[PDB]
Amino acid sequence: YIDRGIPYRRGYLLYGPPGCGKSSFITALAGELEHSICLLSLTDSSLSDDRLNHLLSVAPQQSLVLLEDVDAAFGLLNALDGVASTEARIVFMTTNYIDRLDPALIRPGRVDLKEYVGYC
Amino acid sequence: LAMARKGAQLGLVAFRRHYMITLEVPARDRSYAWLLSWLTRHSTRTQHLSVETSYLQHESGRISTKFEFIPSPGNHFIWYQGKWIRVERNRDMQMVDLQTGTPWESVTFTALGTDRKVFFNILEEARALALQQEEGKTVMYTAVGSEWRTFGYPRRRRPLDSVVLQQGLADRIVKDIREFIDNPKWYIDRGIPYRRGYLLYGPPGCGKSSFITALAGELEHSICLLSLTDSSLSDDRLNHLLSVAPQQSLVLLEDVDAAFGLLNALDGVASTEARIVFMTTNYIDRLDPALIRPGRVDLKEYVGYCSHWQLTQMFQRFYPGQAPSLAENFAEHVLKATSEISPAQVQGYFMLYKNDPMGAVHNIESL
């Protein structure tokens, strides 16, 4: 990645109905490959946008950042990427309804992969 | 009677040794470890050995052990260029060393001859293995309140040739900086402030900031950046910030067009040594006309939409070992089908074909 002038970043985004085991699967994958995780809820009044940028910029090493219920939010379109690209800043974003999603959350660089988990 | 003289003859032959034998002695201060790690790779059959571990226990409960091997106490023998060299790793009861909490652990090299040009090269070749491992990071800084702070952790410097602009700009800029930095005495004598600021301009999404941080990582400097589109910043504050920038660093100013005291704040009595400045902009039309005269803004360059050589170098750098004529035709197709493009948009369009060269060159018309 470094040679070809691309930021070291590859974010996924899961979506599906509620009560499917999403967060369980994420923390399981985190425990599998010897990483830690930090989660933040977007439905928190104390959070600000510039604050969010400062938070996601300085995430600790060897960790995945988790964003729950992104549908109820919308700067994130700008805050996901920046000059503050720390090494190995993977991101996970989960959602209960894909219909509310913005159309610019699938292009590469911001959101690499997309998958659908749902009824059995 | 004869005994005192036995001791005397031995005392006399001891002095004769000094003018033929050579020695060398560290004292457990920042050359022990280097000069004993070098003493492993040279022989590799060295019995009489010993151990040193490293066990740091990262966050997240990870464990990152290793081993590092050393020659034991006692004596050893080795064969450098022409001579035989004898090592003693002496260790004693002179132990109370609170600088390290452990015993003394002297090393001593000894050998014959008079040419002391041997042990010097030993030190140097040990310094080689000592220094080659650690890779120079590139620390970032950021403004808060009225001070600079270590925003984030260190990073991996990209190579200078990582991004590529229009042909010539990189070598030109780095040559100018090399001239400005290598010869400082040229400036102090002639009563000129030690300052030489550039200013880039062009369209958005061209790789400007990437090129700046790359150049910073190339020539062993750090950088601090400040955004002018910040309400917390004041003008007198800005003066205090830019006055007290740390040593061996470039200051970066993003989006100067949306600002306008800076006309006065760029220069002052507060000229610290080696206060280089970089200023980037998306539209040159909004610029004030007094941002080109020497002393304030030395050089000016234009980076923008791509060319023939640029896309070829991009395509050649992405995939190694493919048809060069294929990449030439790729750039030709992009040029004839697209009147203008950016490195950002081409990077985006080109990322969709990971390790699919033939695909990427067959799928041109999507633009």
Place this chain on the structure above:
Amino acid sequence: RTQHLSVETSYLQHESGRISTKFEFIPSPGNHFIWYQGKWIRVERNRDMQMVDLQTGTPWESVTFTALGTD
């Protein structure tokens, strides 16, 4: 031409991850001889087990010049 030598380094590690090593060379413990203006002068760099020197955390390391004459 002073054989019987020893070493002292400096390794400070500036900010920005820079490294600024060097070397500085010293005469070893034991004895040495030298030739100033007219006389022969004898050096001893004596070092002992009188070691507990918390002002520096290391041993004592006395230097002594000696020579003849009265001037």
Place this chain on the structure above:
Amino acid sequence: LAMARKGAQLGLVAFRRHYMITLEVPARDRSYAWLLSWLTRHST
């Protein structure tokens, strides 16, 4: 006279040992405990 030479012959045979015998030495730093817990399970 013969004594200094007894010591000398012993000093000479001591060097011969170095090229046939092998050694290994820790120093109470993050391998003592491991390398002595292993030394229990092996013999019993």
